[PDB]
Amino acid sequence: TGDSGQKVIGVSISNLDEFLTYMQDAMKEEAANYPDFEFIFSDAQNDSTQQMAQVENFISRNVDAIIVNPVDTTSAVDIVNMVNDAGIPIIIANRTFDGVDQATAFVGSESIQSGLLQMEEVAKLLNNEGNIAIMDGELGHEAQIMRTEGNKQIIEEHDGLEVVLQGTAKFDRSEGMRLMENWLNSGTEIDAVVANNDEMALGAILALEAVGKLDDVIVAGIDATPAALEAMKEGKLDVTVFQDAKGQGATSVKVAVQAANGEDVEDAMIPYELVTPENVEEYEAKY
Ligand SMILES: O[C@H]1[C@H](O)[C@@H](O)[C@H](O)[C@@H](O)[C@H]1O
Ligand SMILES: [Cl-]
Ligand SMILES: [Mg+2]
Ligand SMILES: [Mg+2]
Ligand SMILES: [Mg+2]
Ligand code: NA
Numbered sequence: 001t002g003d004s005g006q007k008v009i010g011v012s013i014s015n016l017d018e019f020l021t022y023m024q025d026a027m028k029e030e031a032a033n034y035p036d037f038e039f040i041f042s043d044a045q046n047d048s049t050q051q052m053a054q055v056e057n058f059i060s061r062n063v064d065a066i067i068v069n070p071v072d073t074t075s076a077v078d079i080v081n082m083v084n085d086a087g088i089p090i091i092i093a094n095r096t097f098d099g100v101d102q103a104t105a106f107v108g109s110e111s112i113q114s115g116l117l118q119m120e121e122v123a124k125l126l127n128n129e130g131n132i133a134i135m136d137g138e139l140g141h142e143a144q145i146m147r148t149e150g151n152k153q154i155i156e157e158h159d160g161l162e163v164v165l166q167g168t169a170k171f172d173r174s175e176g177m178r179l180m181e182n183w184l185n186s187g188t189e190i191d192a193v194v195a196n197n198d199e200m201a202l203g204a205i206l207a208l209e210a211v212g213k214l215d216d217v218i219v220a221g222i223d224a225t226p227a228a229l230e231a232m233k234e235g236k237l238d239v240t241v242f243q244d245a246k247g248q249g250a251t252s253v254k255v256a257v258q259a260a261n262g263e264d265v266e267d268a269m270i271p272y273e274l275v276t277p278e279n280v281e282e283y284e285a286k287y
Pocket of ligand 5: 214215216217218219236238
């Protein structure tokens with residue numbers, strides 16, 4: 001090696017939402033294993049201009065690697081272009097975008113797989129017959145587009161399955177509750193509420209509980225957060241899909257360190273796993 005300077009990794013997470021908080025905690029835990037590195041853990045607070053300013057700062061500091069969880073798929077491209085031009089490795093964590101193969105590596109999970117797994121199980125529970133209400137996450141996130149696409153690919157496989165409602169609750173619990181309330185007030189018949197993440201599903205459950213209709217509707221989410229697993233244990237949540245926050249966070253740090261140390265790195269695609277009341281205790285154990 002040509003020097004003995006402390007190395008530095010700059011991290012910009014989109015925000016600290018329910019799932020991403022677990023990922024960030026896992027990044028911080030893994031980062032503690034590398035005493036020859038300093039880490040800068042920054043939070044973009046869902047603001048792409050702030051994320052761009054964080055990345056520009058990392059470039060100007062000449063950090064040894066950058067980890068980004070992109071706020072949106074448009075600015076993601078500008079970020080990767082800029083960091084590539086700077087000659088600094090850039091690891092993309094958890095959120096992908098069109099153009100991701102220009103980054104140094106991607107660490108995350110394949111979104112359409114979670115929508116396919118989720119809706120396959122809901123279809124089984126419905127015996128392939130039912131009116132489906134889909135809760136989109138944050139519009140234009142790849143996870144939103146592709147979880148819903150996976151849902152629809154299963155729905156299109158079965159003539160008795162039909163999407164009757166589709167709206168966004170912005171990956172948010174309170175918005176999920178409001179959306180469910182509005183859907184209930186529309187009088188539309190719903191057999192399953194299928195949400196792009198667990199927070200929205202948990203919001204829908206609160207609304208369904210409030211009018212005594214939770215036993216009449218199948219509810220599904222994605223992430224298998226501890227909150228979701230508790231709802232499943234209580235018999236409120238029928239389906240979720242484990243996304244490995246700890247694995248994504250620890251692996252992103254490991255890959256960034258490798259790249260910072262001058263090694264070529266590669267993607268890490270961590271599988272999604274179906275969670276049902278039959279295997280829920282196995283996923284509690286992951287926390
Ligand atoms: O910020 C979102 C949010 O945490 C979702 O709940 C999770 O499924 C997505 O992977 C993540 O990008
Ligand atoms: Cl949240
Ligand atoms: Mg030297
Ligand atoms: Mg590559
Ligand atoms: Mg129910
Ligand atoms: Na159909």
